[PDB]
From a paper:
Human topoisomerase II beta ([name]) modulates DNA topology using energy from ATP hydrolysis. The C-terminal half of the [name] domain forms the transducer domain, which connects the [name] domain to the enzyme core (Oestergaard et al., 2004). A heart-shaped dimer is formed with a central cavity that is 31 Å high and 23 Å wide, the dimensions of which cannot easily accommodate a DNA duplex. Each [name] [name] protomer folds into two discrete structural modules: the N-terminal GHKL domain and the C-terminal transducer domain (colored yellow and orange respectively in Figure 2A).
The structure was solved to 2.6 Å by molecular replacement using the [name]:[name] structure as a search model. The final ADP-bound model contains residues 47–422 with missing loops between residues 169 and 173 and 356 and 366, where the K loop resides. The γ phosphate-binding site is now occupied by a sulfate ion present in the crystallization condition (0.2 M ammonium sulfate), as is observed in TOP2A (Wei et al., 2005; Stanger et al., 2014). Thus, our ADP structure represents the post-hydrolysis state with the sulfate group mimicking the ATP hydrolysis product, Pi. The transducer domain of the ADP monomer opens up toward the C terminus of the protein (represented by dashed box in 4A), signifying the relaxed conformation. Moreover, during the reorganization of the transducer domain, the QTK loop is shifted away from the ATP-binding site (represented by dashed box in Figures 4B), preventing Q392 and K394 from making contacts with the nucleotide. Specifically, the side chain of Q392 moves by 3.8 Å and K394 moves by 2.5 Å.
Author numbering:
A (entry chain A), B (entry chain A): 47 to 168, 174 to 355, 367 to 422
Write the structure that this text describes.
């Protein structure tokens, strides 16, 4: 009665945040971040993993639209801590503003407003069709505007109090250029925070750079300002800038775009195996089977001393594209799909291995 | 239309197994297992993490009933690979066989047959109210019998084809002793297996010992046979049996039951920091904040050489009880709750630290 209960999905996510967005409790560790005044750096940061995940969900959704429509050119990220607002703007193709014939609602409502809703069910980050709704549910306020020329209409609706309230949809006729814009005020009470502080903002800032880094052919703007990153190699520069090798010489980097789904720089490590890596624009900070795949080859080749001893002098950077990825966790820092399932190959030329001989 | 879709919860779990039970793909690593002929040993094992999780769900549910009713004395685990059947029997209090007034179904149906159903919503392993249903959904066949004297009835129902079919409930009047018995034939096609092989059976076998180890005041029988484990210390013996120290002498173990929720043995390690540990009878093989809590103290004390250097000569075994645990993953190998949230303290006497001086 009171003992034996059944929860709604909504009620349940609220009852079991952990289970959906990750820990809603503080976690302190060394992380790569973009601080305002220093830029890219590795330091002890303290933040709530579940806060990072509602943001990264929305930012990855923009990234995915580029794989959906390659005519997409730009993403604007804006973070206003004092007002507690975050907004993510992309162009290319919007979301059809049309009544969905089966579910009898406008498609943007359906996919931002109801659970288990995705265009990716039947090489995005998106797959499970929670994500947007999770952000919505962990926001005091959550606004969707989208406009799709092909369907001749623009859409705008606002949800409130963790997706429990909602304005009706504002629907107008539209012939402009497509955009989707997601604006949310996360619910800081659920993460036990006053404000978005230096630590979460520097992490969030790092994801916009990551996206410049990860997402081919898309300008990224942070707070109205273009990010000077064009190419994976220039993103990697952010990290290797004023790194020293053993002889007080700055690090050589080796680049090879192996094909459109594998993009790889390599260099020396002087504090053991490290890795920066992305699958479908998602920062796999713990790593994955995609990292293992690649490293294998390299260790494999280099040797021509056990493998593991060489892993300790490598710093690998991978931007890759994988069909239907899986992960250890809800914050996805490690990616668990098998190589025989990735849907593409990484084959690195001799040139790369030979260039690679010639740093430490 | 075809593009923008909404899945049922059922459809979705089937569509996204990974997301619920973990990888449904082979994973190979060194693991602790009970092989038939050697007993407890650490070796490269290959198995499907999602197979282990439907089993461990049911076996943990029995363990939890002991915290629900301490008059529970016994759990029978039976694994029949040739027939593809597994059955888990416990006594103590059954499940009320009564129509649930709100949901208008017998309670056992509701809690084994519908999702987001739990008696733990408002110090079990159970919390999220998926688990049983997940097992049901990854079984070609799944049978529940329960009997609760207080409600004057016994219950029996069978589900089939991943919880898509079901006999009506067999309901009879009952005045005997309470039992709950869960019998399932996992769906091997979803894990891409022919049979349950040596590797999954030795893992499953190890969990029954773990339960003898973890679960105070409950006999455990594997395949009709009592397990000679009474006490945490005797379980620990399984691992330290014919271990050597540095001078070819078998390992000393130090025991302290700090209180009813912390139970701790310690010894030497000669292949670096290791840990065997349980929260609410769940094998946290990766570890957790509960492991960190304890180790802290010990390192802390011992020193009276950096902390980390001592971690490399410890082998810690923890059986603990935690209020409302969280985990990195769906297979729960690491547990993520903060110490200030555990709901109890571990304070170890001087005797323990002083005894602990006197091995390596
Ligand atoms: N920025 C965006 N541009 C276009 N469509 C989007 C965008 N964000 C979300 N969507 C659509 O709404 C759906 C729901 O997003 P989400 O909840 O993340 O599901 P998924 O895990 O499939 O990404 C997506 O599958 C996608 O079709
Ligand atoms: N062996 C058992 N004995 C008694 N009740 C059980 C048993 N197994 C499951 N139940 C009940 O059915 C519910 C559903 O089990 P499960 O799906 O694991 O939910 P939970 O995560 O709460 O354990 C449990 O909350 C518990 O109340
Ligand atoms: Mg998404
Ligand atoms: Mg359970």
């Amino acid at each position: 009665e009171r003992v034996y209960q059944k929860k709604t999905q909504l009620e349940h996510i609220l009852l079991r945040p952990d289970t959906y967005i990750g820990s809603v409790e503080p976690l302190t560790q060394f992380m790569w971040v973009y601080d305002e005044d220093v830029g890219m750096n590795c330091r002890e940061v303290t933040f709530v993993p579940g806060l990072y995940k509602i943001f990264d969900e929305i930012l990855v959704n923009a990234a995915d639209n580029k794989q959906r429509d390659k005519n997409m050119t730009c993403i604007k990220v804006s973070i206003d801590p004092e007002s507690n607002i975050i907004s993510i703007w992309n162009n290319g193709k919007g979301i059809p503003v049309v009544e969905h014939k089966v579910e009898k609602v406008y498609v943007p409502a359906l996919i931002f407003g109801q659970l288990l809703t995705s265009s990716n069910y039947d090489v995005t980050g998106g797959r499970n069709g929670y994500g947007a709704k999770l952000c919505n549910i962990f926001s005091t306020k959550f606004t969707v505007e989208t406009a799709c020329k092909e369907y001749k209409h623009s859409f705008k609706q606002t949800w409130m109090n963790n997706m429990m309230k909602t304005s009706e949809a504002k629907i107008k006729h539209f012939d402009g250029e497509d955009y989707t814009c997601i604006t949310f005020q996360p619910d800081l009470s659920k993460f036990k925070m006053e404000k978005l502080d230096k630590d979460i903002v520097a992490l969030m800032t790092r994801r916009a750079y990551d996206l410049a880094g990860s997402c081919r052919g898309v300008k990224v703007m942070f707070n109205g300002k273009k990010l000077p990153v064009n190419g994976f190699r220039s993103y990697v520069d952010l990290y290797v800038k004023d790194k020293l090798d053993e002889t007080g010489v700055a690090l050589k980097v080796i680049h090879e775009l192996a094909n459109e789904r594998w993009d790889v720089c390599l260099t020396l490590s002087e504090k053991g195996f490290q890795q920066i890596s992305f699958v479908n624009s998602i920062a796999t900070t713990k790593g994955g089977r995609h990292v293992d795949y690649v490293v294998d080859q390299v260790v494999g080749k280099l040797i021509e001393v056990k493998p593991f001893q060489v892993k300790n002098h490598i710093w690998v950077f991978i931007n890759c594209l994988i069909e239907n990825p899986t992960f250890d966790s809800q914050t996805k820092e490690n990616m668990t799909l098998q190589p025989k399932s990735f849907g593409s190959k990484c084959q690195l030329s001799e040139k790369f291995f030979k260039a690679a001989s010639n740093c430490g």
